[PDB]
UniProtKB/Swiss-Prot annotation, chain A:
A Gene Ontology molecular function term of the record: structural constituent of ribosome
Domain of life: Eukaryota
Record's subunit section: Component of the large ribosomal subunit (LSU). Mature yeast ribosomes consist of a small (40S) and a large (60S) subunit. The 40S small subunit contains 1 molecule of ribosomal RNA (18S rRNA) and 33 different proteins (encoded by 57 genes). The large 60S subunit contains 3 rRNA molecules (25S, 5.8S and 5S rRNA) and 46 different proteins (encoded by 81 genes).
Main subcellular location: cytoplasm
Keywords in alphabetical order: Cytoplasm, Ribonucleoprotein, Ribosomal protein
Family: Belongs to the eukaryotic ribosomal protein eL31 family.
The protein's name: Large ribosomal subunit protein eL31A
Classification via SUPFAM superfamilies: Ribosomal protein L31e
Source species: Saccharomyces cerevisiae (strain ATCC 204508 / S288c)
Subcellular location, record wording: Cytoplasm
InterPro entries, alphabetized: Ribosomal_eL31, Ribosomal_eL31_CS, Ribosomal_eL31_dom_sf
SMART domains, per database record: Ribosomal_L31e (SM01380)
Task of the protein: Component of the ribosome, a large ribonucleoprotein complex responsible for the synthesis of proteins in the cell. The small ribosomal subunit (SSU) binds messenger RNAs (mRNAs) and translates the encoded message by selecting cognate aminoacyl-transfer RNA (tRNA) molecules. The large subunit (LSU) contains the ribosomal catalytic site termed the peptidyl transferase center (PTC), which catalyzes the formation of peptide bonds, thereby polymerizing the amino acids delivered by tRNAs into a polypeptide chain.
UniProtKB/Swiss-Prot annotation, chain B:
Modified residues (Phosphoserine): 29, 36
Gene: RPL19A
Site of covalent link Glycyl lysine isopeptide (Lys-Gly) (interchain with G-Cter in ubiquitin): 20, 52, 59
Role of this protein: Component of the ribosome, a large ribonucleoprotein complex responsible for the synthesis of proteins in the cell. The small ribosomal subunit (SSU) binds messenger RNAs (mRNAs) and translates the encoded message by selecting cognate aminoacyl-transfer RNA (tRNA) molecules. The large subunit (LSU) contains the ribosomal catalytic site termed the peptidyl transferase center (PTC), which catalyzes the formation of peptide bonds, thereby polymerizing the amino acids delivered by tRNAs into a polypeptide chain.
Name the record gives this protein: Large ribosomal subunit protein eL19A
Compartments where found: Cytoplasm
Swiss-Prot record, chain C:
Protein name: Large ribosomal subunit protein uL22A
Sites bearing Phosphothreonine, chain numbering: 69
Miscellaneous comment as given in the Swiss-Prot or TrEMBL entry: There are 2 genes for uL22 in yeast.
GO molecular function: structural constituent of ribosome
Alphabetical GO biological process terms: cleavage in ITS2 between 5.8S rRNA and LSU-rRNA of tricistronic rRNA transcript (SSU-rRNA, 5.8S rRNA, LSU-rRNA); cytoplasmic translation
Organism: Saccharomyces cerevisiae (strain ATCC 204508 / S288c)
Domain of life: Eukaryota
Oligomer status and interactors: Component of the large ribosomal subunit (LSU). Mature yeast ribosomes consist of a small (40S) and a large (60S) subunit. The 40S small subunit contains 1 molecule of ribosomal RNA (18S rRNA) and 33 different proteins (encoded by 57 genes). The large 60S subunit contains 3 rRNA molecules (25S, 5.8S and 5S rRNA) and 46 different proteins (encoded by 81 genes). uL22 is associated with the polypeptide exit tunnel.
Subcellular location: Cytoplasm
Free-text function comment from the UniProt entry: Component of the ribosome, a large ribonucleoprotein complex responsible for the synthesis of proteins in the cell. The small ribosomal subunit (SSU) binds messenger RNAs (mRNAs) and translates the encoded message by selecting cognate aminoacyl-transfer RNA (tRNA) molecules. The large subunit (LSU) contains the ribosomal catalytic site termed the peptidyl transferase center (PTC), which catalyzes the formation of peptide bonds, thereby polymerizing the amino acids delivered by tRNAs into a polypeptide chain.
Keywords, comma-separated and alphabetical: Cytoplasm, Isopeptide bond, Phosphoprotein, Ribonucleoprotein, Ribosomal protein, Ubl conjugation
Length: 109, 62, 175
RNA sequence: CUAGACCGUAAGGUCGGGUCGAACGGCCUCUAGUGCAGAUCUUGGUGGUAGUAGCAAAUAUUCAAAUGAGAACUUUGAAG
């Protein structure tokens, strides 16, 4: 299919961080997002925008949001590439509410 | 690069703590070439090194 | 030169060494024994899969109180590990011996690890501090590693008078 | 060094082969700091234990870039 594609996802961080230790809720949220992007785009290489990291840690280490709207852009690895030819780039989506949104495909052009 | 010395110099020159010294991440090489307090002063002047204003302790609730 | 016992043709062999290597001797012995006798490219692919935890190094001698894994299944074992530091050192020597082999003119596709040997290098000494003002040794167990890659290559009977006569008798009553 | 050989009940002696590099034996006598398994023996070296016990107090780290062969840990920025 189209190796380079970008989509809109909402991730239920509530169930993924359910029961997780308080001091590692936000670091676990980072790892769950990387796992999420790996599952959806099939890329081992996942890179999170610092503004997405800021979104994760907005309410501190213990107060990750239940749902988070993400824009995942699978692209072509360049600049003296690593092993993989493709990588996923995750950046946050500014929405007043991250609820009641479906996975959609973003047109680059 | 290692800018640990430049940030300490910038704190001394500007007169703030190291916690208040902002070094431009896009000017790492130019900062690295600044090894003297005179060079730090010129970098503060042209804005490569910025004073990074105080976080406010508001009294309005008090 | 002067390796351990080898029984191969030096003309179609190449070799590599690393001495005094700061890497666990027990782990490196197991890693070496895991690729002993394998074809060279099969072992290098396998070592890459060990690095990313898809396949394991079976631990057969130095394994008391190791954990258990399903990745030991293919080797008939339950105790297997992923010694990344040993694997890096071995695959570094595999690369060198390969470089030596096609420097000598050897063919790549017929190369197999004919000899791989790990020996204890001299220990590097540190100290660890114990209860009641006691000091104990805190030692590294370094490794000497050597390996050779080789191209895969493709009574008079004494009879008594009775025995001779019986043979003659069988010949005159058989045809 | 040598599950190669021979002599002696034995302490031992001799020979072959490998390694090695500068001295050393047989016999008659003289002399002793003259023979080790032990001494919680002395000094030094080395194991099993064992890749084991563990590396858990001081609330806590995270994203990206830069550097570099290599970055959980270096630097810078962002954030907590
Ligand atoms: Mg629970
Ligand atoms: Mg245990
Ligand atoms: Mg201690
Ligand atoms: Mg013997
Ligand atoms: Mg000499
Ligand atoms: Mg004596
Ligand atoms: Mg003794
Ligand atoms: Mg005795
Ligand atoms: Mg342990």
């Amino acid at each position: 299919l189209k190796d380079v594609v970008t989509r809109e996802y909402t991730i239920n961080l509530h169930k993924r961080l359910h029961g997780v230790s308080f001091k590692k809720r936000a670091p676990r949220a980072v790892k769950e997002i990387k796992k999420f992007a790996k599952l959806h785009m099939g890329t081992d290489d996942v890179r999170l925008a610092p503004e997405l990291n800021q979104a994760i840690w907005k309410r501190g280490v213990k107060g990750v949001e239940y749902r988070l709207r993400l824009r995942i852009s699978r692209k072509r690895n360049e600049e003296e590439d690593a092993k993989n030819p493709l990588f996923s780039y995750v950046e946050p989506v500014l929405v007043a509410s991250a609820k009641g949104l479906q996975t959609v495909v973003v047109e680059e052009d | 690069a290692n800018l640990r010395t430049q940030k300490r110099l910038a704190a001394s020159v500007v007169g703030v703590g190291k916690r208040k010294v902002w070094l431009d991440p896009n000017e790492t090489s130019e900062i690295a070439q600044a090894n003297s307090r005179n060079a730090i002063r010129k970098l503060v002047k042209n804005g490569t090194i910025v004073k990074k204003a105080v976080t406010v302790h508001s009294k309005s609730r008090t | 030169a002067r390796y351990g016992a080898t029984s191969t043709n030096p003309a179609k062999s190449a070799s590599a060494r690393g001495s005094y290597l700061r890497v666990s001797f027990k782990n490196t012995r197991e890693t070496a024994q895991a690729i002993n006798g394998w074809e060279l490219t099969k072992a290098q692919k396998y070592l890459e899969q060990v690095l990313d935890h898809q396949r394991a190094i079976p631990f057969r001698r130095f394994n008391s109180s190791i954990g258990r894994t399903a990745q030991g299944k293919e080797f008939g074992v339950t105790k297997a590990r992923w010694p990344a530091k040993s694997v890096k050192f071995v695959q570094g020597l595999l690369q060198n011996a390969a470089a030596n082999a096609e420097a000598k003119g050897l063919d790549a596709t017929k190369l197999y690890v004919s000899h791989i040997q790990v020996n204890q290098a001299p220990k590097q000494r540190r100290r660890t501090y114990r209860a009641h003002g006691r000091i104990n040794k805190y030692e590294s167990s370094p490794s000497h590693i050597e390996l050779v890659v080789t191209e895969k290559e493709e009574k008079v009977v004494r009879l008594t008078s009775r025995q001779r006569g019986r043979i003659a008798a069988q010949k005159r009553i058989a045809a």
